[PDB]
Amino acid sequence: GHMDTSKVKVGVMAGAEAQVAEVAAKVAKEKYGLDVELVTFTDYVTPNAALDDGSIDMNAFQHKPYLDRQVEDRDYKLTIAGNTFVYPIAGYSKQVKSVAALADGVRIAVPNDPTNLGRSLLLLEQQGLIKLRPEVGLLATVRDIVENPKNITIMELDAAQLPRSLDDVALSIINTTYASSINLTPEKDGVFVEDKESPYVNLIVARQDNVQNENVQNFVKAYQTEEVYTAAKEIFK
Ligand code: MET
């Protein structure tokens, strides 16, 4: 028009997650008269940078381990505003339906950022594919492997490249953020799935100096409404 409405920029991930954010934005307008503008991203390392730089007022795409790690490596100054959902990561495959009877020497693809790499290795261990040292935490790496019976080779790739990895490796642990973009769900296609209970619940994060504002708080509330939840269930099969 000739003048625009006052809006708040929320950063989210393209695809399934943006669809969920769309409903939240819908609920935010009806309940709080909060006009929201979704800003979709395709890479995990961008959202916090945008938030910190002032390009967006908040984002919804990460879990605490990831945020803490990124704040430590770049010094962003952010504060958690509220929890969203948990997306139990899963291992998928266009070749096998089970982990037992996985040929020896196979390649297994996993994300390469530190917190999701560690998460994947922990998950593999739960499958009995490998064993990690006793004191390893949430940041395990290949240097922490103390047992590898099937002689597996861990291929670390950028999270957004894991979908396409299914065509080159025996099995890939993919964030639902991307697995959904190729119509895969843990419940329907997962060879194995991470437990619901874990430290990976997603969050709505804002800057340290704006987290108190009702704009941030209200969006958080809208995202936790029954409506959005219902829409989310649908969106993820
Ligand atoms: C940047 S960490 C992102 C986590 C991802 N959405 C998951 O829940 O698997």
Side-chain angles (χ1 to χ4, degrees), residues 1-74 76-237:
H2 93 71
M3 209 185 121
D4 277 344
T5 288
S6 175
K7 299 193 182 189
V8 61
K9 288 175 183 162
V10 178
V12 305
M13 301 310 289
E17 281 176 41
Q19 293 184 62
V20 176
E22 218 95 59
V23 185
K26 177 187 171 293
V27 167
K29 185 196 294 178
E30 319 185 316
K31 286 179 170 283
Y32 316 113
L34 209 208
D35 287 317
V36 173
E37 158 163 287
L38 273 6
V39 179
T40 64
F41 291 81
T42 56
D43 204 313
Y44 287 155
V45 300
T46 312
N48 289 326
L51 177 49
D52 186 66
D53 289 321
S55 303
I56 54 178
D57 299 277
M58 65 186 95
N59 61 48
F61 77 108
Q62 74 206 298
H63 45 58
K64 192 165 177 284
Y66 186 94
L67 167 65
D68 292 343
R69 178 62 187 217
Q70 181 132 290
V71 157
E72 187 179 64
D73 301 316
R74 330 230 68 145
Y76 290 141
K77 316 234 297 188
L78 310 171
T79 308
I80 295 174
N83 304 329
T84 51
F85 305 115
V86 180
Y87 293 106
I89 200 139
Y92 305 85
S93 173
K94 312 239 279 187
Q95 313 295 177
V96 294
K97 187 191 172 181
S98 78
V99 150
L102 199 36
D104 276 27
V106 294
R107 241 134 59 85
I108 290 186
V110 309
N112 57 9
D113 55 284
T115 64
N116 288 294
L117 205 198
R119 181 184 182 183
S120 293
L121 296 176
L122 283 177
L123 180 59
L124 286 173
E125 181 176 45
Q126 292 304 288
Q127 254 40 61
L129 290 171
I130 63 142
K131 190 181 174 303
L132 299 163
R133 72 190 187 74
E135 288 273 331
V136 76
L138 293 183
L139 301 179
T141 72
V142 177
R143 287 188 303 284
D144 297 307
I145 295 162
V146 303
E147 207 178 299
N148 183 4
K150 287 178 171 301
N151 307 323
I152 306 179
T153 283
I154 303 300
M155 295 297 291
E156 291 163 43
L157 313 170
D158 175 288
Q161 287 310 278
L162 272 321
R164 163 62 191 180
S165 82
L166 291 173
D167 294 301
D168 309 292
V169 301
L171 181 150
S172 305
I173 289 176
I174 309 175
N175 296 280
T176 297
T177 302
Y178 297 100
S180 66
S181 72
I182 58 174
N183 199 54
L184 300 178
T185 71
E187 271 292 4
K188 185 175 174 177
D189 313 282
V191 175
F192 53 73
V193 186
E194 183 187 60
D195 295 356
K196 295 181 186 65
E197 288 167 47
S198 63
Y200 307 106
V201 64
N202 287 196
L203 324 160
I204 291 176
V205 181
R207 281 191 294 288
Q208 194 164 285
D209 61 16
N210 70 166
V211 71
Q212 71 293 322
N213 299 328
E214 277 203 65
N215 313 304
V216 178
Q217 297 302 310
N218 287 334
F219 181 74
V220 170
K221 217 180 291 70
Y223 208 115
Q224 310 180 318
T225 59
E226 203 78 51
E227 196 180 322
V228 173
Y229 175 61
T230 293
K233 279 150 72 183
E234 243 305 288
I235 292 165
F236 287 97
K237 279 65 165 193

